[PDB]
Design an enzyme around this catalytic site. Structure first.
Site, PDB file in Angstrom:
ATOM      1  CG  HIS A   1     -14.616  14.531  83.608  1.00 39.91           C
ATOM      2  ND1 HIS A   1     -14.422  13.785  84.749  1.00 39.91           N
ATOM      3  CD2 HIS A   1     -15.058  13.670  82.662  1.00 39.91           C
ATOM      4  CE1 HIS A   1     -14.736  12.524  84.505  1.00 39.91           C
ATOM      5  NE2 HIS A   1     -15.125  12.429  83.245  1.00 39.91           N
TER       6      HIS A   1
ATOM      7  CG  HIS B   1     -11.743  22.025  78.393  1.00 35.64           C
ATOM      8  ND1 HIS B   1     -11.270  21.534  77.197  1.00 35.64           N
ATOM      9  CD2 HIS B   1     -10.772  21.794  79.305  1.00 35.64           C
ATOM     10  CE1 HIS B   1     -10.072  21.011  77.385  1.00 35.64           C
ATOM     11  NE2 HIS B   1      -9.746  21.160  78.654  1.00 35.64           N
TER      12      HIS B   1
ATOM     13  CG  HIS C   1      -8.471  22.067  83.486  1.00 36.39           C
ATOM     14  ND1 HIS C   1      -8.810  20.739  83.622  1.00 36.39           N
ATOM     15  CD2 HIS C   1      -8.183  22.245  82.174  1.00 36.39           C
ATOM     16  CE1 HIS C   1      -8.704  20.137  82.452  1.00 36.39           C
ATOM     17  NE2 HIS C   1      -8.330  21.028  81.558  1.00 36.39           N
TER      18      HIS C   1
ATOM     19  CD  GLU D   1      -5.333  20.449  83.677  1.00 33.16           C
ATOM     20  OE1 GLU D   1      -5.247  20.401  82.439  1.00 33.16           O
ATOM     21  OE2 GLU D   1      -5.798  19.520  84.373  1.00 33.16           O
TER      22      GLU D   1
ATOM     23  CG  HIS E   1      -6.612  23.412  78.418  1.00 35.37           C
ATOM     24  ND1 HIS E   1      -6.611  22.341  79.283  1.00 35.37           N
ATOM     25  CD2 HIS E   1      -5.547  24.175  78.758  1.00 35.37           C
ATOM     26  CE1 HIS E   1      -5.579  22.447  80.099  1.00 35.37           C
ATOM     27  NE2 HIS E   1      -4.917  23.552  79.802  1.00 35.37           N
TER      28      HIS E   1
ATOM     29  CB  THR F   1      -4.318  17.573  81.382  1.00 37.82           C
ATOM     30  OG1 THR F   1      -5.612  18.144  81.201  1.00 37.82           O
ATOM     31  CG2 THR F   1      -3.239  18.396  80.677  1.00 37.82           C
TER      32      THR F   1
HETATM   33  N1  LIG Z   1      -7.256  19.021  79.103  1.00 38.39           N
HETATM   34  S1  LIG Z   1      -6.842  18.732  77.586  1.00 38.39           S
HETATM   35  O1  LIG Z   1      -5.541  18.131  77.587  1.00 38.39           O
HETATM   36  O2  LIG Z   1      -7.041  19.930  76.820  1.00 38.39           O
HETATM   37  C1  LIG Z   1      -7.959  17.523  76.956  1.00 38.39           C
HETATM   38  C2  LIG Z   1      -8.555  17.702  75.715  1.00 38.39           C
HETATM   39  C3  LIG Z   1      -9.394  16.716  75.214  1.00 38.39           C
HETATM   40  C4  LIG Z   1      -9.624  15.559  75.955  1.00 38.39           C
HETATM   41  N2  LIG Z   1     -10.480  14.536  75.451  1.00 38.39           N
HETATM   42  C5  LIG Z   1     -10.753  13.326  75.982  1.00 38.39           C
HETATM   43  C6  LIG Z   1     -11.629  12.742  75.118  1.00 38.39           C
HETATM   44  C7  LIG Z   1     -12.266  11.399  75.172  1.00 38.39           C
HETATM   45  O3  LIG Z   1     -11.400  10.443  74.563  1.00 38.39           O
HETATM   46  C8  LIG Z   1     -11.473  10.225  73.209  1.00 38.39           C
HETATM   47  C9  LIG Z   1     -10.597   9.275  72.708  1.00 38.39           C
HETATM   48  C10 LIG Z   1     -10.628   8.966  71.358  1.00 38.39           C
HETATM   49  C11 LIG Z   1     -11.519   9.600  70.516  1.00 38.39           C
HETATM   50  C12 LIG Z   1     -12.382  10.552  71.018  1.00 38.39           C
HETATM   51  C13 LIG Z   1     -12.366  10.872  72.364  1.00 38.39           C
HETATM   52  N3  LIG Z   1     -11.864  13.614  74.098  1.00 38.39           N
HETATM   53  N4  LIG Z   1     -11.166  14.709  74.296  1.00 38.39           N
HETATM   54  C14 LIG Z   1      -9.023  15.397  77.187  1.00 38.39           C
HETATM   55  C15 LIG Z   1      -8.199  16.379  77.697  1.00 38.39           C
HETATM   56 ZN   LIG Z   2      -7.949  20.797  79.553  1.00 42.86          ZN
END
Ligand SMILES: NS(O)(O)c1ccc(-n2cc(COc3ccccc3)nn2)cc1
Ligand SMILES: [Zn+2]
Length: 258
Positions: free
Chosen positions: A62, A92, A94, A104, A117, A196
């Site tokens: 992603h 990371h 986008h 975003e 981010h 997001t």
């Molecule tokens: N783009 S963002 O809003 O910065 C963003 C930051 C982090 C995530 N993200 C998604 C996941 C995967 O989901 C998890 C859920 C519970 C515990 C561990 C992982 N882990 N991190 C998804 C999006």
């Molecule tokens: Zn992000």
């Protein structure tokens, strides 16, 4: 049939597997600069990255994550709208297929070429997995990228991307200093929101810097050579991995600056 950024699995489909996609505090949002109100009670941001320990860079299908050692208070974010200490776990980006899209968050409907981010979790919850279950579990520092002059501090990231072209590939990535990705000013907007991407959990205090960083066309072109697919699969370029702005609903965006 997993979520992604294609026609049949993109943002408009996510609600079927993740109904919180239509929730009350989803991200990103458009930042209406004239409606955002200066909040004089907001503190300066404290970004303390001098002891940051980067470990690895991963193409997760992603985006790519630069991962940090978050087993101690090394790199932390404090102050601003935040109560307590938030530990840097990863950053990371986008980005778009063209320079006119990729971010975003938007600013008065303007889309930037990309958005960085820096993801932090609240150390009162002990681990990241526990933190995402809390309304104040995460703080994400968002920084816009525009295309112009090169960002020297980004080049080490750019140059390792050839080694993590496809989903599931990782590479050692030690001694990277995220201070080289910051703009001069820490003026920011802040609001309560969400991850997001799926699982879209409503656990994030967003802190979006007003000042973009500049990266070169060559730098962003290298982002666009990454692949969503795994090795030996049909090539799908990793581009347009951004969620569009979501309804603001019952939220106010606050500004740290006049
Ligand atoms: N783009 S963002 O809003 O910065 C963003 C930051 C982090 C995530 N993200 C998604 C996941 C995967 O989901 C998890 C859920 C519970 C515990 C561990 C992982 N882990 N991190 C998804 C999006
Ligand atoms: Zn992000």
């Amino acid at each position: 049939h997993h979520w992604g950024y294609g026609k049949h699995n993109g943002p408009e489909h996510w609600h079927k597997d993740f109904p919180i996609a239509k929730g009350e505090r989803q991200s990103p949002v458009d930042i209406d600069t004239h409606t955002a109100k200066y909040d004089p009670s907001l503190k300066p941001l404290s970004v303390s990255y001098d002891q940051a320990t980067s470990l690895r860079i991963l193409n997760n299908g992603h985006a790519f994550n630069v991962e940090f050692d978050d087993s101690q208070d090394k790199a932390v974010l404090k102050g601003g709208p935040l109560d307590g200490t938030y530990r840097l776990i990863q950053f990371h980006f986008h980005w778009g297929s063209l320079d006119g899209q990729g971010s975003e968050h938007t600013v008065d409907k303007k889309k930037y070429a990309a958005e960085l981010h820096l993801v932090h979790w609240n150390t009162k919850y002990g681990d990241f997995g526990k933190a995402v279950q809390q309304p104040d579990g995460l703080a994400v520092l968002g920084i816009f990228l525009k295309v112009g002059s090169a960002k020297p501090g980004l080049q080490k990231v750019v140059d390792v991307l050839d080694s993590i072209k496809t989903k599931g590939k990782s590479a050692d990535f030690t001694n990277f200093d995220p201070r080289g990705l910051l703009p001069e000013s820490l003026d920011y907007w802040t609001y309560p929101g969400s991850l997001t991407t799926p699982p879209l959990l409503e656990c994030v205090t967003w802190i979006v810097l007003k000042e973009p960083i500049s990266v070169s066309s060559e730098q962003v072109l290298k982002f666009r050579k990454l692949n969503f697919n795994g090795e030996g699969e049909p090539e799908e370029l990793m581009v347009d991995n951004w969620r569009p702005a979501q309804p603001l609903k019952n939220r106010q965006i606050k500004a740290s600056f006049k």
